[PDB]
Design a protein around this nucleic acid. Structure first.
Ligand SMILES: [Mg+2]
Ligand SMILES: [Zn+2]
Lengths: 170, 147, 55, 56, 222, 14, 110, 7, 1112, 94
DNA sequence: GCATCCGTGAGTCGAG
DNA sequence: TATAATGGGAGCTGTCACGGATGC
């Protein structure tokens, strides 16, 4: 089992670019919590680390600048989304997270086929790669938009299906 | 797989079948310490045979051996891999009696120990790469030009 | 140093005694009142170490 | 008419010739137009759309 | 422009048989034994099945569900067996310099045994695309060199020359012949099929193979 | 096989 | 006592002990807090001369671990116990002013 | 209970 | 609200009491209302009768038993976490045979749990349900030998744990073998012990094909019954001395002893019918006049040989036939545990009878009731068939009470369960539902009793059929077993009838499950109803005949998962069973006799009956179910109302005017929308939230104990160290949050202090203490706080204190406080929705009203479902539902459409026409013509062949409307959708899988004891499991550092994780991992196995990963 | 996709070597607070805040861009490790 | 050489 | 610390899926 990791129900978000995904605000706050303490001390939001953590302990103690600080924390970084069962390497992919209201993780439509996820209640787990090395591996080799072909057959994996095919055919 | 309309490159299938023909059974030990029937890797028996021919000795007569994935997996060299698969007690006794060493060649071993796997960013081929800008590279070039 | 190999072999009774920090003599766990480790028991502090750091 | 196989071959060829950056852009585009058009096209399902042929 | 027809043709949703059940007859049904009822379900779903028709179908339904549930398990097991028996295989060098290779046959013996016939395109693509020629191959006045990574077009051309009877089998670098220890080299392997370029030295081939063989396992019957 | 049965036999010997 | 490997649930996938938190070892938060405490205390003990800072480090045990009496820090520094206690007082007091000013060490008092 | 999620 | 019903099938009988399988079974087992002398020998009475007399000399016999009244009422038991149960007394008498002295006393045996009115139990405060078990019936069976084609195996099976399975076989050497306890020996020997002589076996088995010669052994008759008996004992018991009385005792106990060997009444009956003989009892043989006498063995051998020869009138048995499989209901299962516990009590009795003061012994001194109590408590607590009750809605509970499990004690392990056990057998018809089963690992092993089906006294399931004589259908109904059913030709319920006469020349019928077309002259019986084929859940799916079974399965399953909604509605389209479900589940409250309603309150209703008596009915209000859903009843009558018998008084949860309400009727459009309904995702209107559609109430229970400690007592208090008045604001004088207070994550529900574990303050703390000049407090803050992601309004607190009346807690506990927290949940993004046809999906988008597709008259739709969910799923019922829904929307009506006798397309078209007149002719009167956009759409429809070209706009719009389709305007543009869209009302439910209960995230948190890895689970603030396969995935990307991080810094590398956190909060890059603690654990566990695991460098010199700490 | 990813894959014999280079460079920038950057002020990757455009905090983003400029050198054994460390510490203190 | 016994395996999360 | 007492009980049964080792 591992630290820095969450899970929620997936929901379709077609507004996302291929390399993106919708990560709930509360989820992201708890996942990046140390980075957010650091960025909070890097601005005027808190005196120090412990003051910031005690500040974030209760939900009514949480204000507006903190979400902007969090926005600044996650910039450029990618999370890992994983859907069990993990049958081949594209069961885990890297996305730049985009903070969203609500409690649901928003998945990009094209990658669905590779996760074998629909939206009839499926869930997914989020993992926050920590080091600079980890992040680099994720953004180069593990990014969804970098993996466009099946390591199995060679043919495309992210590719139009359902509504998309329908619209273009029509 | 074709039957079910699954496109799947022969490559992978050949990698596995390759792991299936990994082993051989001696039919005549020749001038070796080996034994008639004793099973070993085709690689190791070819190295021994080349060392024995290089010594002007009799090479080892051996037979190609096919074995299915499970046996072939348990039959690995690295006992840390074999133990974490199946028939743990068997593997572990065999190894402890043999006083076996695991060279941490595979991924499984390193995964268990929590090392950096010998793969991808962890390949000995690429991990030793260095990076430097032209400014620092020239400053260091001046330091090397000094001495 | 860097760990490059891992060996596995039989433990001689002498090796086992070398590892040992003491022989457990009693089939006793912790005292039924003080809830502390018994002497020469499975949870003795005299053998396996202190319960508290540096105490 | 554009369907599954042809769109697949388009994405392959696009990967090959124009790289994964452009193929990503193209994919997101295809996504946008495909969905937006599917919306307005008027595709629905009513019981009469299962047309039993007389031949039967 | 009928919705079912559209969704079917486009590959957006549905196959002929499902559609057939929606409109035509449902079809023949199976007894729990594996035997087939002499009486077919004459109704469509749009018409509405009888009680007895529904009950007759339930057998098949239950059987298929049980097939799913009991399949997932053994497919997983196979995946894990494969992962364990291949895990140590990674692309370790650029070339093992083996002079050995395999010969992918473009023609297979017909079941009539009358002659040899060409193999299916998909199949030849499965054994050729992204492979490296271990010998010089010249057909239709084009020169395919020793060392060349067969792009998809190279394959198609090779099929075209095959139909022209200039070539019956293709010499290629294969893992079955690689002599790289504890792995395979770059040439013997071939294209990193995920990127349609040669495989990067250091890519965990074994795992990827086990996963590629694994994933569709949950689609194969019991 | 069964240690009870065994000891009972060894006792049934004297 | 009850078994730690007492099955929970109708599957083999759960043990009672799998639910039992390990209170003993310190969490990363706790250890980090102790590190920042030691570093902030060193930051506030550098605002004293090395003498008074060293007497405050010997009377509280941030040095050899234990707390020395006034007679031992007075014999070590070569002063009277009244004097060693006096510079302890002025160190404590200067520390109290430093704290009333910067307010850095307030948050650690829980 | 199991499958795509009836129960 | 007119309710129009369709269909021509007249149901001759209503459904039986739906919980009867529970209630009647338990009532039968207890016989609590039966005067002792009138009790039948069944149930616990039979258990007593098998256990007693207890002998060895003293003798303790049994007279009768009695059950007293429960010490606490059900409600009070639910509150105090007590079992609802009745005291059991047994009247016992002790005879000393020699003295003649008789001492008689009533001894207390402990308590037995009582079944509530609705068929469930209360065990330690929690509602529980005993699930019926299906198993192989006892009896004699003949099956084909899979090894030898012309050869057969005989099997004699008794009740579970009532003795061994015995096999008879004809060996390749021709001798007939018996197998008992995995011991193969020649049957001949046993036949000799039974008293059989070579003459009798020769004349009995003679006719057969020399098989009898394999039974011929000279050496066996040479030993007469005594030596043969000792020979067999030596064969079955190696090493055990072959004493005569030991052999007699052993063989008797194994074969003839009704106390150690029992075929059921079922096994006995079936064996009788199969071998064509008559049994004196439930054992294979008897001990009569000093010797052993045969019952079963010879007839069984006779049959086996006959079947092997090919002699006509001998069949193998289908073991999956529902004639050979029976149901153990609550009564039988409980009785089985009771019998075990009684046997243990008897071992105890005999124990105490050997020891003692032998002159003074009362029944009281002899009976220790403890083992009996233990067996009962064990059954009701830890048995596999005893399941925490599903009360999510009333259908959940009912279905749960109607479940059948092939698993459990003496049942199938899922590992042993292949396709044959899980199949729908032909005999399931009318008995066990073919549709309703789980998709996962339990498929076909857990099932549901069919709606008309009843379990008989023998445990076999029986289904009703109407008698038919000379083409005339009687109102006589006969319930048959599958074995019985197999003898007849039975017509389908939908066969046309004029009066009571069969009106078709060709009628569809079954013979042994096989479909066959017959004349009315040959029809012996007829189905009662299509309804009888399916479960209660499946009977709730309208237009079922149009849905593929696989999707029907899902709709069935998901109804169980519906959340009670504050505004819940009955379906626009119903199957007609929606009222009976509410009634039989005891959800709603009903009038007892005719009368006038006296008082009506939110809290209670008072009725005056014709007797003149006032009856007061309390209402259950905002009670928390097992699953946390709100269960409360709301009064449906007003003061002075005249009510007749069985009239509705109050609606329970998920009830609208006595009809089952699992969800909402919403106006749906079936079209794609901008990718927001892609892959089963669902788009909804904000208008649903605005009007509180899909709003449900949920109550959570938090609990905390203050106990005595060695370090001093914990206490519930308002005085909590280092907390502001801000944090204590909503706490009362005693330290408990006030009723009505809003609590959010981090807030204190119950303040608690505990004396600190003895502290070595670190020098940092001593110095910091000197600096702030404040004494470290004696105690610390242990208070109960609201967990992450939870919260709401406090509606109740319970406080139980030691030293208070009625109250005794578990040892060491000073007090227990419970806080109940209620929330109103509005539908949100991520909540799961579904319909009865198996269409399910998560809400992906909530659109403002102006963004929604709307009808030309300005009315926006509620829900947008993707049509792509249809073709591949082949569930067209949802479509028909929608069409009829459309009609119902404009006509203001609801429908009853019975399964397989429904509304049909033509009638729905008529109704749709009517509705068109309402939807349009209104517009024509209001002064508006057809819209331009309508004209454009009409043009496209004409191209689609949807409407006939040349008709007026009105005639064409009517044509579309009759196809169920309408013009729709996009709310964003105002331009019409280019085709006409299907729109109508659909019944959709919100399921219990809610994103609010699911979302979870962790930075750092608790670690496991031995492994030092993060805990699992949301309640424990756990981390996600990164399993073997996720590892394979990372390896395949060759992402080595991310992986190494997962294996070290983010899990069990202690120094690593601490250093990582410290580094991140400092803004420093994370440091290099070191050895994970679980590898260290591996090493130590291998050392304890006497293996030496050594980490070496490349020079083969040891490296210490324990950093010297483990090396002396 | 990451901007210019095709060229980046073009610059190396193995994609993983690209990752190692990018990552090591990112750590060099973090350790030296970006003072060692080869990007000119106009080439600096930016992030939109509420105030206005600011420097992009993401060192990996930076590294990829520098790699994209051609201003970086990479390969095995360009220089002994301690010498590189000490020189970079001399030129840009942290 | 060919029947036969015993011991080891039997997918993934999440919640219990 | 003192009549004499001298061999035990519970099994538990619808799955393979073979794998090797052991036996006429
Ligand atoms: Mg799904
Ligand atoms: Zn090679």
């Amino acid at each position: 089992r591992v630290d820095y990791s969450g899970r929620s129900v997936i929901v379709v978000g077609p507004q996302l670019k291929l390399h993106q995904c919708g990560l709930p605000k509360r989820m992201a706050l708890e996942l990046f919590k140390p980075f957010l303490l650091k960025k909070m001390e890097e601005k005027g939001i808190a005196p120090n680390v412990k003051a910031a953590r005690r500040m974030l302990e209760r939900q009514r103690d949480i204000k507006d600048e903190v979400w902007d600080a969090l926005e600044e924390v996650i910039h450029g970084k990618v999370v890992l989304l994983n859907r069990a069962p993990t049958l081949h390497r594209l069961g885990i992919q890297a996305f730049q997270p985009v903070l969203v209201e609500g409690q649901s993780i928003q998945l990009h439509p094209l990658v669905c086929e590779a996760f074998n996820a629909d939206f009839d209640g499926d869930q997914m787990a989020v993992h926050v790669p920590l080091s600079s090395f980890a992040q680099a591996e994720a953004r180069i080799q593990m990014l969804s938009a970098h993996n466009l072909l099946s390591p199995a057959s060679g043919e495309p994996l992210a590719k139009p299906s359902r509504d998309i095919i329908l619209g273009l055919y029509y | 797989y074709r039957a079910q309309g699954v496109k799947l490159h022969d490559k992978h299938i050949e990698i596995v079948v390759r792991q299936m023909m990994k082993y051989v059974e001696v039919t005549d030990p020749g001038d070796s310490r080996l034994l008639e029937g004793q099973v070993l890797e085709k690689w190791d028996v070819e190295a021994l045979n080349e060392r024995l021919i290089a010594e002007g000795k009799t090479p080892v007569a051996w037979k190609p051996l096919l074995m299915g994935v499970t046996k072939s997996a348990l039959s690995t060299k690295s006992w840390l891999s074999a133990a974490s698969f199946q028939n743990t007690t068997h593997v572990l006794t065999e190894a402890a009696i043999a006083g076996k060493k695991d060279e941490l060649i595979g991924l499984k071993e390193n995964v268990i120990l929590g090392r950096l796997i010998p793969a991808g960013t962890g390949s000995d081929f690429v991990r030793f790469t260095q990076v430097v800008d032209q400014k620092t590279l020239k400053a260091i070039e001046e330091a090397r030009k000094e001495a | 140093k860097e760990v490059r190999k891992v060996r596995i072999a039989l433990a001689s009774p002498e090796k086992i005694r070398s590892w040992s920090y003491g022989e457990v003599e009693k089939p006793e766990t912790i005292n039924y009142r003080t809830l502390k480790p018994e002497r020469d028991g499975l949870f003795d502090e005299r053998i396996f170490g202190p319960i508290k750091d540096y105490e | 008419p554009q369907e599954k196989n042809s769109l697949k071959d388009l994405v392959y060829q696009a990967f090959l010739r124009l790289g994964m950056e452009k193929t990503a852009r193209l994919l997101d585009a295809l996504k946008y137009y495909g969905f937006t058009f599917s919306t307005t096209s008027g595709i629905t399902i009513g019981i009469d759309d299962a047309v039993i042929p007389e031949e039967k | 422009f009928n919705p079912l027809y559209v969704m079917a043709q486009s590959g957006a949703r549905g196959n002929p048989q499902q559609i057939r059940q929606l409109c035509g007859l449902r079809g023949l049904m199976q007894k729990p034994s594996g035997e087939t009822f002499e009486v077919p379900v004459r109704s469509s779903f749009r018409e509405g099945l009888t009680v007895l028709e529904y009950f007759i179908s339930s057998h098949g339904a239950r059987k298929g569900g049980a097939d799913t549930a009991l399949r997932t398990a053994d497919s997983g097991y196979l995946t894990r067996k494969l992962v364990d028996v291949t895990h140590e295989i990674v692309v370790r060098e650029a070339d093992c310099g083996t002079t050995n290779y395999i010969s992918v046959p473009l023609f297979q013996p017909d079941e009539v045994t009358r002659s040899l016939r060409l193999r299916k395109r998909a199949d030849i693509e499965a054994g050729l695309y992204g492979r490296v020629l271990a010998r010089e191959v010249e057909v239709l006045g084009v020169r395919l060199e020793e060392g060349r990574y067969l792009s998809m077009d190279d394959v198609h051309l090779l099929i075209k020359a095959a139909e022209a009877g200039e070539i019956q089998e293709v010499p290629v670098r294969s893992p079955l012949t690689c002599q790289t220890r504890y792995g395979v080299c770059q040439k013997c392997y071939g294209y990193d099929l995920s990127m349609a370029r040669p495989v990067s030295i250091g890519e965990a081939v074994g795992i990827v193979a086990a996963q590629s063989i694994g994933e569709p396992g949950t689609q194969l019957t019991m | 096989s069964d240690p009870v049965r065994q000891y009972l036999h060894e006792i049934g010997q004297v | 006592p009850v078994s730690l490997e007492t099955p929970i649930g109708d599957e083999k996938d759960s043990f009672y002990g799998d639910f039992i938190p390990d209170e003993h070892l310190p969490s990363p938060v706790d250890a980090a807090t102790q590190s920042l405490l030691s570093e902030e205390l060193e930051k506030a003990l550098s605002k004293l001369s090395e003498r008074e800072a060293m007497v405050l480090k010997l009377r509280k045990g941030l040095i050899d671990g234990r707390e020395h009496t006034l007679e031992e820090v007075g014999a070590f520094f070569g002063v009277t116990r009244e004097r060693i206690r006096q510079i302890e007082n002025k160190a404590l007091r200067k520390l109290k002013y430093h704290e009333s000013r910067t307010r850095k060490l307030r948050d650690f008092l829980d | 209970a199991x499958x795509x999620x009836x129960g | 609200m007119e309710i129009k019903r369709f269909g021509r099938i007249r149901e001759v009988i209503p459904l039986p009491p739906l919980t009867e399988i529970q209630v009647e079974s338990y009532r039968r087992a207890l016989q609590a209302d039966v005067p002792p002398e009138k009790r039948e020998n069944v149930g616990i009475q039979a258990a007593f009768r098998e256990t007693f007399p207890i002998e060895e000399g003293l003798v303790l016999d049994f007279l009768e038993y009695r059950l007293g009244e429960p010490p606490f009422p059900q409600d009070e038991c639910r509150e105090k976490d007590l079992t609802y149960q009745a005291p059991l007394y047994a009247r016992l008498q002790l005879i000393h045979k020699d003295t003649g002295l008789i001492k008689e006393d009533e001894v207390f045996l402990g308590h037995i749990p009582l079944m509530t009115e609705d068929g469930s139990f209360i065990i330690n405060g929690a509602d529980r349900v005993i699930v019926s078990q299906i198993h192989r019936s006892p009896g004699v069976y003949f099956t084909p030998d899979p090894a030898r084609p012309g050869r057969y195996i005989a099997s004699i099976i008794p009740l579970p744990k009532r003795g061994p399975w015995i096999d008879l076989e004809v060996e390749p050497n021709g001798v007939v073998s018996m197998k008992v306890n995995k011991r193969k020996f020649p049957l001949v020997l046993l036949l000799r012990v039974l008293g059989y002589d070579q003459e009798t076996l020769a004349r009995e088995l003679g006719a057969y094909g020399e098989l009898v010669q394999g039974l011929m052994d000279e050496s066996v008759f040479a030993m007469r019954p005594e030596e043969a008996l000792i020979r067999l004992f030596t064969l079955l018991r190696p090493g055990d001395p072959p004493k005569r009385d030991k052999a007699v005792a052993y063989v008797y106990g194994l074969i003839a002893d009704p106390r150690r060997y029992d075929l059921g009444e079922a096994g006995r009956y079936k064996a009788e019918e199969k071998l064509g003989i008559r049994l004196s009892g439930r054992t294979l043989a008897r001990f009569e006049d000093g010797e052993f006498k045969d019952e079963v063995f010879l007839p069984t051998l006779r049959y086996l040989f006959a079947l092997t020869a090919g002699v006509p009138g001998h069949e193998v048995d289908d073991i999956d036939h529902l004639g050979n499989r029976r149901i153990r209901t609550v009564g039988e299962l409980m009785t089985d545990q009771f019998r075990v516990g009684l046997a243990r009590l008897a071992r105890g009795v005999r124990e105490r009878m050997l020891m003692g003061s032998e002159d003074s012994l009362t029944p009281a001194k002899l009976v220790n009731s403890r083992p009996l109590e233990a067996a009962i408590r064990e059954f009701f607590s830890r048995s596999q068939l005893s399941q925490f009750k599903d009360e999510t809605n009333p259908l959940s509970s009912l279905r749960h009470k109607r479940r059948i499990s092939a698993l459990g004690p003496g049942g199938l392990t899922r590992e042993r369960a292949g396709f044959d056990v899980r199949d729908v057998h032909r005999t399931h018809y009318g008995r066990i539902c073919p549709v309703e089963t789980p998709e996962g690992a339990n498929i076909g092993l857990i099932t549901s009793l069919a709606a008309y089906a009843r379990v008989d006294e023998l445990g076999f399931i029986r289904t009703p059929y109407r008698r038919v004589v000379g083409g005339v259908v009687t109102d006589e109904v006969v319930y048959m077993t599958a074995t019985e059913e197999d003898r007849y030709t039975i017509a389908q319920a939908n066969t046309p009838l004029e009066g009571n006469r069969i009106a078709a020349e060709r009628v569809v019928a079954r013979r042994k499950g096989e479909p066959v077309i017959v004349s009315p002259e040959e029809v012996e019986f007829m189905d009662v109803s299509p309804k009888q084929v399916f479960s209660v859940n499946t009977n709730l799916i309208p237009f079922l005949e149009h849905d593929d079974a696989n999707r029907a399965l899902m709709g069935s399953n998901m109804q169980t998962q519906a959340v009670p909604l504050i505004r819940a509605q009955a379906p626009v389209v119903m199957t007609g069973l929606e009222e009976r479900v509410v009634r039989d589940s005891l959800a709603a409250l009903y009038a007892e006799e005719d009368g006038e309603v006296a008082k009506v309150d939110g809290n209670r209703i008072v009725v005056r009956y014709e007797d003149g008596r006032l009856v007061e009915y309390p209402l259950r209000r905002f009670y928390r179910s097992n699953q946390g859903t709100a269960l409360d009843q709301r009064p449906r009558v007003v003061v002075g109302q005249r009510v007749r018998k069985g009239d509705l008084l109050a609606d329970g949860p998920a009830s609208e005017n006595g009809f089952l309400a699992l969800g909402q009727n919403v106006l749906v459009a079936i079209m794609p929308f901008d990718g927001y309904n892609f892959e089963d995702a669902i788009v909804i209107s904000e208008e649903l939230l605005k009007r509180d559609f899909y709003t449900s109430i949920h109550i959570e229970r938090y609990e905390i104990e203050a106990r005595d400690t060695k370090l001093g007592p914990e206490r519930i208090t308002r005085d909590i160290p280092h907390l502001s008045e801000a944090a204590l604001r909503d706490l009362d004088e005693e330290g408990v949050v006030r009723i009505g207070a809003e609590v959010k994550p981090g807030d204190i529900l119950v303040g608690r202090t505990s004396f600190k574990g003895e502290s070595e303050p670190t020098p940092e703390e001593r110095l910091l203490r000197s600096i702030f000049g404040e004494k470290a407090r004696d105690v610390k803050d242990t208070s109960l706080r609201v967990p992450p992601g939870e919260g709401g309004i406090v509606v109740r607190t319970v406080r139980l204190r030691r030293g208070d009346p009625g109250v005794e807690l578990k040892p060491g506990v000073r007090e227990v406080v419970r806080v109940y927290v209620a929330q109103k949940r509005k539908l949100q993004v991520g909540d799961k929705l579904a319909n009865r046809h198996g269409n399910k999906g998560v809400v992906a988008k909530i659109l403002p009203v102006e963004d929604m597709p709307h009808l030309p008259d300005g009315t926006p739709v509620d829900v947008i479902l993707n049509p792509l969910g249809v073709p591949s799923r082949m569930n067209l019922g949802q479509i028909l539902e929608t069409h009829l829904g459309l009609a119902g929307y404009f006509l203001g009506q609801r429908y009853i459409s019975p399964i397989f006798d429904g509304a049909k397309e033509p009638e729905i078209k008529e109704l749709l026409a009517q509705a068109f007149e309402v939807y349009f002719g209104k517009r024509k009167g209001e002064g508006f013509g057809v819209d331009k956009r309508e004209v454009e759409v009409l043009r496209r429809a004409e191209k689609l062949g949807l409407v006939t070209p040349g008709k007026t706009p009105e005639e064409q719009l009517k044509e579309l409307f009759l196809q169920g389709k309408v013009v729709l305007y996009d709310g964003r543009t105002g331009e019409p959708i280019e085709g006409p869209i299907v729109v109508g009302q659909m019944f959709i439910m919100k399921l219990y899988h809610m994103v609010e209960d699911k979302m979870h995230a962790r930075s750092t948190g608790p670690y496991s004891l031995i492994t030092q890895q993060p805990l699992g689970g949301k309640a424990q603030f756990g981390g996600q499991r990164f399993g073997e396969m996720e590892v394979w995935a990372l390896e395949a990307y060759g992402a080595a550092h991310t992986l190494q991080e997962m294996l070290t810094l983010k899990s069990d590398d202690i120094e690593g994780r601490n250093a990582a956190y410290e580094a991140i909060i400092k803004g420093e890059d994370v440091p290099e991992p070191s050895v994970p603690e679980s590898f260290r654990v591996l090493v130590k566990e291998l050392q304890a196995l006497a293996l030496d695991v050594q980490t070496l460098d490349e020079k083969d010199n040891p490296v210490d990963i324990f950093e010297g700490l483990a090396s002396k | 996709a990451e901007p210019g990813i095709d060229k980046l894959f073009g610059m190396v014999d193995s994609k993983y070597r690209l990752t190692v280079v990018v990552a090591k460079r990112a750590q060099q920038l973090l350790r030296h607070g970006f003072k060692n950057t080869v990007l000119e002020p106009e080439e600096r990757p930016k992030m939109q805040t509420l105030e206005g455009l600011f420097d992009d905090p993401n060192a990996v983003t930076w590294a990829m861009k520098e790699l994209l400029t051609g201003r970086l050198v990479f390969g095995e054994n360009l220089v002994p490790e301690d010498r590189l460390q000490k020189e970079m510490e001399r030129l840009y203190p942290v």
